[PDB]
Amino acid sequence: MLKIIIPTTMLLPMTWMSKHNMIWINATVHSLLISLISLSLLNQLGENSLNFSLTFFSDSLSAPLLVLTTWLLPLMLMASQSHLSKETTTRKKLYITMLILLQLFLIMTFTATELILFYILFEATLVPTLIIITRWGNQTERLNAGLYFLFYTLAGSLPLLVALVYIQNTTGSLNFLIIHYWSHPLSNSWSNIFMWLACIMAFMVKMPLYGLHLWLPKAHVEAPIAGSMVLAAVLLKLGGYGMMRITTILNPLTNYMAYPFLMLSMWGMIMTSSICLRQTDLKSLIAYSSVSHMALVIVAIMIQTPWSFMGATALMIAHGLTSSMLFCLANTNYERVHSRTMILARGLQTLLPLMATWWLMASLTNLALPPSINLIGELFIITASFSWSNITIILMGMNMMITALYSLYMLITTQRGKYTHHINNIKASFTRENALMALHILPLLLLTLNPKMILGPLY
Amino acid sequence: IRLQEDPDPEDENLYEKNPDSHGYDKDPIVDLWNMRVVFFFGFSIVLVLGSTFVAYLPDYRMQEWARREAERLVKYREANGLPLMESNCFDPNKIQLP
């Protein structure tokens, strides 16, 4: 894994020692080359994981996420170029360094073979994200959003640290391979119940769960474009990755303990999709849609069936791409009109035609038009839940309908109608923004042709 | 209440100074080379070369190997009259029941 890690680390000295003109160019070029290197990890032996070393391993679950992060870094730099132009060279380099540290931490989290190291790196991501949000946000609420994000995540995580240390003491090892191979069943005792809660709750917080999702809207709304992109695409997926990894330890109690979170996620998906219908801010609407899709992912993980896990992996990747693209599309309008109110900018299809097509494709993926990977994941999850209970179809179908409604309502309001007369600052879309949208869309559409890559280990 | 500079006007359009801005910077040369770097190293290299690399990635998932083994097993079992799939994953004798 050092083939990827070491170059990512060298990205920092290059960025710091690069000329003021050339920071973005060098960062983008070398990040893209690193992403190209990451594509080698997609080749996964079916039976066994790629155990590169004692510290690091990759499987059919970690590989797609690593590729996603490496891909995301250059898109994040491209998106963040515009609003950081006025910033001084040192601050721009610090922002790029925060992004690079975040990528390094995420890669090590995904490839780490020990749960304690995974915890250290997974919590470590808070610092760069917190710094980004609270230093390069454009609103007074960036500080409160940072406090909420940090404290929600830490309150979830710390009991996880206690539980992991206890597991290390009892089983004797926190290496995932040994844990999987031995994996003695849990007993239905209050102590084991609370251990299950401690293990699950941190990832339940990271993956916005209904009742623990309040941090996500504030953080995504108040964060800069790059921070929103990472939070939606990758940081949420850390919870899913950990929950899929951690579920091995808690085999039997999961059936008994799943019902509260299963019900919360299933009803919350409807609740948040309905929330999206009446939201007045584009970023907030995108965030709530993210919440709903991650609720679908949570249901898939809790059910603990192979098809559900494959759907969860596919949905994680597809949603990361789609939500990042949606945030970037909203950010372009925000830069042009300097407001996140949906009503303020209208009829943008006439003014900016190609951005309208980008919006259409992003919304279609959001509403799971087949054969999109979004639909593949959602359909697999839906079938697994149908096996879990035939009555599940009602809520899932209602959620599908509400998702289509809110996605196309966003598209109609922002990109359709008569243009807002007074707004005169709309200017022809730059090649950079269209290139960012295309870089988002094309990999998602291409991944449909070969869907085994994003279908996870159980495939 | 304070001596603060007037809010800067909306950042000057890069088009005004350079009509073919391409974005990516104020200086036109860096704009062109940034666009070229992005387009080459993502579209031409990562998407096309990377997509080809994924498409022809060697089948270490053993799908064809599994299919060939299944064909052999099906032919043998049908020829010998043995059931196509045995109900017991592991041989009963080795198991010692309580």
């Binding site: 390069w136 946000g137 454009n138 300097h338 | 209440i1 304070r2």
Partner: peptide, 14 residues
Amino acid sequence: ARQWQPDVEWAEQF
């Protein structure tokens, strides 16, 4: 528009 930075009223609360 520019990133909001603390005002005198915000500072006085501390």
